[PDB]
Design a protein around this nucleic acid. Structure first.
Lengths: 84, 51, 85, 52
DNA sequence: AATGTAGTCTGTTAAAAACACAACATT
DNA sequence: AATGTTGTGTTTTTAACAGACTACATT
């Protein structure tokens, strides 16, 4: 409910996800899909990390406290998406 | 009656690392929440570790 | 390139669509304390993914799990979370 | 070389349900018999299906 | 009849969390 | 000199994981 992308109206991010997948599922020509959770997750993690790090003016400690994840976890998540 | 982080920690059943204690404050794990009174924290004598 | 795109008319990624909802959220937040955001974002992304994949596999939990690349137990647990038991 | 149940199954001409493949191991229907190394089984990359 | 699945279990382990500590910066 | 940060180790706890299985469904 608190997360909305200015579509001009205020449609949730929940709806925005459903549409990208409807387009993906259509684009897929019956190919086997071994890992989708990660496809979606990596696409949502990379921007989330970039938004908070910007918001906390680079403070890893604060960024971690904000997201509700361990500092080690944030560090690991950043290193994944080459933000180390 | 108020105490320093050092004082409070040293009174606890299992005194922990000061870095860990200052971390608990930051993580809202100490009740009543200690506040920086100027340059440093004031834990109230009744302070306790919370979830 | 990025297989996940929402028809904005152009094809802008979901990665961009996430950045915008958060920019709006951060602005909407009137200095309230934010203890857990990862979950806020995650639950908002999981609930639709599940509903979509489940629809695509015509209700098959087994297949849905294999597709997402998560353990069957995990999918079951994820569904029960968002009341899709 | 050894493979996981998942890996082996996915290589087979007609990959079957993981639960079906497990039931088979339990039934001594995979040769050489895959072994439980901790949390999971290990199949010979060229392991075969047999009649019960 | 052979194989596939929902549901309800077990145990194993990789991952996250929590705690360390040594630098050095900020207060 | 107390407190905060980053970088890097450990130890502890959580959660995903593979599998066991039975009744029923699909093939």
């Amino acid at each position: 409910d608190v997360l909305t992308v200015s579509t001009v109206t205020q449609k949730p991010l929940r709806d925005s996800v459903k549409q990208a997948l409807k387009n993906y599922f259509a684009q897929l020509n019956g190919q086997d899909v071994n890992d989708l959770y990660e496809l979606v997750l990596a696409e949502v993690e990379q921007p989330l990390l970039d938004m908070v790090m910007q918001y906390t003016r680079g403070n890893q400690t604060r960024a971690a406290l904000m997201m509700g994840i361990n500092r080690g976890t944030l560090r690991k998540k950043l290193k994944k998406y080459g933000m180390n | 009656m108020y105490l320093t982080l050092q004082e409070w920690n040293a009174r606890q059943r299992r005194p922990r690392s000061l870095e860990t204690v200052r971390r608990w404050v930051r993580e809202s794990r100490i009740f009543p929440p200690p506040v920086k009174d100027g340059r440093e924290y004031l834990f109230h004598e009744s302070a306790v570790k919370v979830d």
